[PDB]
């Protein structure tokens, strides 16, 4: 019970310039925001939203997949503490989206998102998009069973 | 005879008050 | 009886001119007695299915009209909007991004496909459906 | 006595 | 509405023409209506063969929407006739362009370079991709926010406007995949400033990317420039194969 | 800022 | 049936291994594979290397499969009185 | 009354008549046909999916047709209707996969039956062909499907399914090519070739289209082949332990080692080794496709029966341009006048990747035979052969051992090599016998003798030209002897030098190399 101390530190864990550590805070964020709901976290949260849209203009491809592979359930447990922080949630979704397909353009591949876009181990890309879009049900799921 | 400055400036950025910097790598 | 000769029009024209004609009419009584869209429902859809700017918003606001009276026609309503998110002239996509958080609201049980479709369209597709998306979440809670 | 990250 | 025909009348008579040549004169005819004066743009559409008169009277009777709504309805039909025709895509493209369907704008301009080459095999004929066209995609890419694709776009451009590819960089709101364009951009100058904003704003791996880039050994500056368009050409290849994919 | 008690508690007054 | 010819002439089954019996046994299924003419299928099924390499279950497959691709199927044109 | 208020129960009456009673199925029958005949919105696109949708035999399949009877003596539209209808309550929730299976296939059958009959069609003409050709665009996503049954029925609905007046939209071309070679690659994973020859009949009758489809599938097609993916079926590729054994048996002292260097210890080491039979035959589908996609039809039944067709030259000239792509897009080298040995000493490391490459991934070897079977693909392939000449040249340099054999796949590959420029033409048959040779050839009389045939191919340089059309036969012949060089010369005299001082054990080779 006495970890919400975190809320004072986790700034300086994000600002910490190792990819794993920065990684660990989005996590420990996204689990402290479904614990406890206050507006300190809520200020943390939209401070780790926008330093995870400077990552994404700032990280090469298979540094993004390593870092955004592991963050996204994150992002759900952020949509499902604070329906204000919603926008700029799905905004960076469609984002990061769209970048990783573009990705997927540019160099050749086999099971073709683009194609498979009207409904194992592979390529980090294809990983991404799918991890993407898998995040996408799941906040839309969370927001209609979740009154 | 002063050599470069690496820094650790405040990035701005849009869609923990408005004074945040990623540290780099030194 | 005599909301007949209308969808007669409708069913045989092929013309701008007199479908919009014939449309700004069922406008003139879906606001007197709304109740008669449920006659022109198929007629609609495929005029739904239509590329034609005047067509496609007056079919939206009368699709929205027709689903304010009843709710219930929503799972009839739904396959054909379905392919208009599916289709590639980038216009009857917007218009329906435009038009879909009343849907979905309206809908309350396949808002889900309904917009995990809107995301894999802004997805491969080039249009931010971001705005529309999250307008739709907010009013669903 | 040390609080942080060092050279940060 | 006086005259021998109705405006639904002649849309049945074209529709129910099929002959190639008098297809694209009369939409060439329409599509001249349209561009005398319909609103303050002068974004003008190419055309084949442009003779009819300039001068135009009942300026204020005329409907300039009926004749844009009727020239997209011609388009529609001879694109259903066949697509392959590059002079039809590049006009429904720019009533795209001028209708601000960025996306469908470049979806189509792709296929037109599709249509005119094979599957960009062989180099794009510059009677096709012409200065203007290749602007136009220019500015529809910079609002459609890929700005590397825009900057590639600038290479492609006959005179390279490092002004606006500079200007495009300069933006950190990117969409388009930065770190993989890198490959496919060939020119010094441009990697160059690439190699000098990465730095400036700290962005090591990228920058360590851009340089590699660089001393890639197919591209020097000093060739022969036999291989220097050999290599631009299998660039261009590849690239256009790969918003080939993206797109459509 | 109080380890101990709790964001969800009352504060002292004086 | 030349080829049939040189391959009767190649393969001896009794100076013949297990694995090269599969050989040519595998050879032939993807010539049938290979084959559109559904005599050709019948006439290199009905050869007596076929039948002597490849087990029946296995022919009586490869013949389902080649008549898998096969259309015909009659259909009633005029419409049903019930009167 | 009766009838609209059937309207909402369409269904369920189409539900009996496919349950078939004794005649119940045939009143029913006749009911849906005047109830559609009465309603406005006519409810034909209606009826026709769910029983098309539910249906599973010939005899509801024959119900179908004479309810169209029916309802096209009435009215018009019904298969444009029906088949938007249908296909968007695919694409949306509904439509489970087995129903879903079911109307395809059935359609499937419909078109296989439409491009048969001679009589049944002709009286009931419905032209599922063209209503399927312009609902071609959304038939792709169900070729990707994930659902086996529906991706086999839409392969075999678009493999039988004609094309419209125009071809194809270009957008809609590289769709379906891109469907239809992931399609091709899963089912080789899953079921083989009798899984692939659908999709093989797909893509050459997209193929044979227009020009630009051909360049399209085989650069796609044999791009796929070269994915780091699909590629192995072709050719092949803790602080709790820590302290309970830790501290170095000393306790009050330091640990023993002064840290790590990385990891450490990389785990896996894992060899490849799945099969090669069979994957000799998935090569030979492959190789079939592309045999049959680069086969121009012509017609003409050249000879009795014995003459093979000729491949097309622009194909084949596709397929060497984007291999070349794939595995060098260096192409500073791609002059096709080849720089000297020097040259190679100076750019030799393209080769050592070139070559690396062709030991992974030896697919190449045959579809550099499908070149060498190909006129100019050799001239087109220059650099490739260039690369791997330089390669083999520095190996054979390398060598100590005095037997060739010791490098099992440095001589298969040199054979290989050699035996494809003499098929490929570029060579007289006496060099094409360097390949018999270098069996029992000594390594540096090989790396000589190699070193030979670089300077013959220096001065017969390959080019599109020289290659003389023949009105007879399309092949392009180059003719021998008429280059002023002509035979090897000093090029054969040397190997004459190398067989006599080793005639030892090539006398019999020596006998076939004769007097050219």
Not at chain 1, 87 to 105: H, P, T
Not at chain 8, 370 to 377: D, E, K, S, T, Y
Request: a neutral charge; hydrophobic letters at 40%; one cysteine or more.
């Amino acid at each position: 019970p006495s970890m919400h101390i975190c809320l004072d530190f986790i700034p300086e864990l994000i600002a910490q310039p190792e990819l794993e550590k920065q990684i660990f805070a989005i996590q420990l964020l996204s689990h402290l925001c479904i614990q406890y709901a206050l507006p300190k976290s809520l200020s943390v949260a939209r401070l780790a939203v926008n330093v995870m849209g400077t990552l994404l203009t700032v990280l090469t491809q298979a540094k993004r997949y390593a870092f955004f592979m592991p963050t996204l359930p994150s992002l759900v447990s952020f949509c499902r503490a604070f329906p204000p922080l919603y926008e700029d949630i799905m905004s960076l979704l469609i984002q990061i989206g769209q970048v990783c397909a573009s990705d997927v353009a540019t160099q050749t591949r086999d099971i073709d998102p683009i194609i498979t876009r009207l409904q194992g181990s592979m390529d980090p890309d294809v990983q991404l998009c799918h991890c993407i879009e898998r995040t996408v049900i799941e906040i839309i799921n969370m927001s209609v069973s979740g009154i | 005879g002063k050599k470069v400055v690496q820094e650790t400036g405040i990035k701005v950025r849009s869609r923990e008050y408005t004074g945040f910097q990623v540290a780099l790598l030194n | 009886a005599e909301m007949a000769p209308y969808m007669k029009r409708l069913s045989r024209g092929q013309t701008v001119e007199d479908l919009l004609e014939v449309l700004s009419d069922i406008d003139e009584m879906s606001r007197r007695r709304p109740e008669i869209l449920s006659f022109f429902s198929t007629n609609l859809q495929r005029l739904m299915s239509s590329a034609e700017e005047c067509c496609r918003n007056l079919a939206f606001s009368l699709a929205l009209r027709s689903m304010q009276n009843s709710p219930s026609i929503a799972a009839a309503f739904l396959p054909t909007f379905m392919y208009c998110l599916g289709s590639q002239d980038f216009e009857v996509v917007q218009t329906a991004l435009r038009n879909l958080p009343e849907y979905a609201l309206l809908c309350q049980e396949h808002a889900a496909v309904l917009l995990h479709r809107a995301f894999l369209v802004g997805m491969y597709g080039q249009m931010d459906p971001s705005a529309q998306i999250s307008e739709a979440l907010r009013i669903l809670h | 006595t040390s609080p942080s990250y060092s050279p940060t | 509405t006086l005259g021998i025909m109705y405006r639904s009348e002649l849309l049945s008579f074209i529709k129910k023409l099929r002959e190639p040549l008098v297809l694209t004169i009369i939409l060439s005819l329409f599509v001249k209506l349209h561009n005398v004066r319909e609103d303050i743009v002068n974004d003008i559409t190419a055309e084949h063969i442009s003779i009819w008169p300039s001068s135009i009277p009942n300026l204020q009777s005329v409907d300039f929407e009926a004749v844009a709504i009727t020239v997209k309805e011609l388009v529609r039909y001879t694109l259903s006739i066949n697509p392959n025709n590059h002079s039809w895509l590049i006009i429904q493209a720019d009533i795209y362009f001028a209708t601000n369907q960025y996306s469908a704008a470049l979806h189509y301009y792709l296929q037109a370079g599709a249509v005119c080459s094979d599957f960009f095999n062989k180099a794009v004929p510059p009677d096709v991709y012409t200065d203007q066209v290749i602007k136009r995609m220019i500015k529809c890419c910079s609002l459609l926010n890929c700005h590397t694709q825009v900057a590639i776009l600038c290479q492609f451009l006959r005179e390279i406007d490092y002004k606006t590819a500079f200007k495009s960089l300069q933006e950190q709101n990117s969409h388009d995949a930065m770190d993989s364009y890198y490959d496919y951009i060939w020119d010094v100058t441009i990697l160059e400033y690439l190699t000098y904003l990465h730095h400036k704003r700290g962005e090591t791996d990228k920058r360590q990317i851009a340089i590699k880039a660089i001393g890639q050994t197919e591209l020097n500056a000093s060739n022969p420039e036999e291989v220097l368009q050999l290599a631009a050409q299998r660039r261009k290849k590849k690239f256009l194969q790969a918003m080939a994919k993206l797109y459509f | 800022t109080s380890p101990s008690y709790s964001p969800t508690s009352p504060s002292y007054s004086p | 049936d030349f080829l049939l010819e040189v391959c009767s002439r190649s393969v001896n089954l009794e100076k013949a291994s297990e694995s090269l019996k599969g050989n040519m046994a595998a050879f032939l299924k993807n010539v049938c594979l290979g084959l559109e003419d559904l005599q050709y299928v019948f006439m290199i099924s009905s050869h007596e290397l076929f039948i002597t390499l490849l087990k029946d279950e296995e022919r009586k497959l490869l013949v389902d499969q080649m008549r898998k691709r096969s259309p015909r199927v009659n259909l009633c044109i005029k419409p049903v009185t019930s009167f | 009354p009766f009838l609209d208020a059937l309207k909402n129960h369409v269904g369920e009456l189409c539900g009996e008549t496919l349950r078939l009673e004794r005649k119940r199925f045939l009143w029913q029958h006749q009911l849906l046909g005047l109830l559609s005949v009465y309603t406005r919105p006519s409810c034909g696109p209606e009826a026709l999916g769910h029983l098309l949708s539910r249906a599973r035999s010939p005899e509801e399949l024959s119900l179908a047709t004479q309810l169209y009877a029916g309802l096209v003596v009435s009215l018009s539209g019904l298969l444009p209707l029906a088949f938007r209808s249908c296909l968007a309550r695919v694409h949306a929730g509904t439509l489970q996969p087995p129903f879903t299976a079911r109307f395809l296939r059935n359609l499937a059958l419909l078109v296989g039956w439409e491009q048969q009959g001679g009589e049944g069609p002709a009286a009931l003409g419905a032209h599922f062909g063209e209503s399927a050709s312009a609902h071609l665009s959304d038939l792709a996503p169900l070729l990707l499907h994930p659902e086996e049954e529906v991706a086999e029925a839409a392969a075999s609905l678009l493999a039988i399914c004609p094309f419209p007046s125009e071809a194809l939209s270009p957008s809609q071309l590289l769709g379906l090519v891109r469907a239809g070679v992931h399609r091709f690659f899963a089912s080789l994973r899953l079921h083989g070739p009798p899984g692939v020859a659908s999709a093989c009949q797909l893509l050459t009758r997209l193929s044979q289209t227009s020009p630009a489809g051909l360049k399209a599938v085989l650069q796609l097609l044999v791009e796929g082949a070269l994915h780091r993916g699909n590629t192995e079926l072709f050719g092949g590729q803790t602080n709790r332990r820590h302290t309970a054994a830790v501290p170095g048996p000393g306790g009050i002292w330091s640990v023993f080692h002064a840290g790590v260097i990385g990891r450490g210890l990389k785990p896996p080491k894992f060899v490849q080794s799945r099969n090669q039979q069979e994957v000799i035959y998935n090569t030979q589908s492959l190789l079939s496709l592309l045999v049959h996609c680069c086969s121009a039809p012509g017609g003409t039944e050249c000879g009795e029966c014995w003459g093979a067709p000729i491949l097309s030259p622009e194909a084949a000239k596709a397929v060497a341009v984007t291999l070349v792509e794939s595995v060098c897009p260096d192409a500073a080298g791609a002059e096709l006048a080849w720089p000297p040995e020097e040259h190679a000493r100076a750019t030799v490391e393209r080769d050592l990747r070139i070559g690396r490459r062709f030991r992974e991934q030896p697919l190449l070897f045959e579809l550099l035979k499908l070149v060498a079977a190909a006129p100019p693909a050799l001239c087109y392939c220059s650099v490739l052969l260039r690369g791997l000449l330089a390669a083999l040249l520095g190996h054979w340099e390398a060598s100590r051992h005095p037997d060739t054999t010791h490098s099992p796949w440095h001589l298969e590959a040199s054979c290989t090599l050699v035996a494809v420029m003499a098929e490929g033409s570029l060579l007289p048959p006496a060099l094409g016998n360097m390949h018999e040779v270098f069996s029992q050839l000594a390594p540096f009389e090989v790396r000589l003798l190699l070193l030979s045939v670089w300077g013959f191919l220096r001065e017969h340089g390959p080019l599109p030209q020289k290659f003389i059309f023949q009105s007879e036969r399309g092949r392009f012949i180059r003719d021998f002897s008429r280059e002023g060089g002509g035979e090897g010369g000093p090029h054969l005299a040397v190997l004459h030098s190398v067989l006599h001082r080793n005639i030892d054990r090539l006398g019999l080779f020596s006998g076939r190399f004769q007097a050219p």
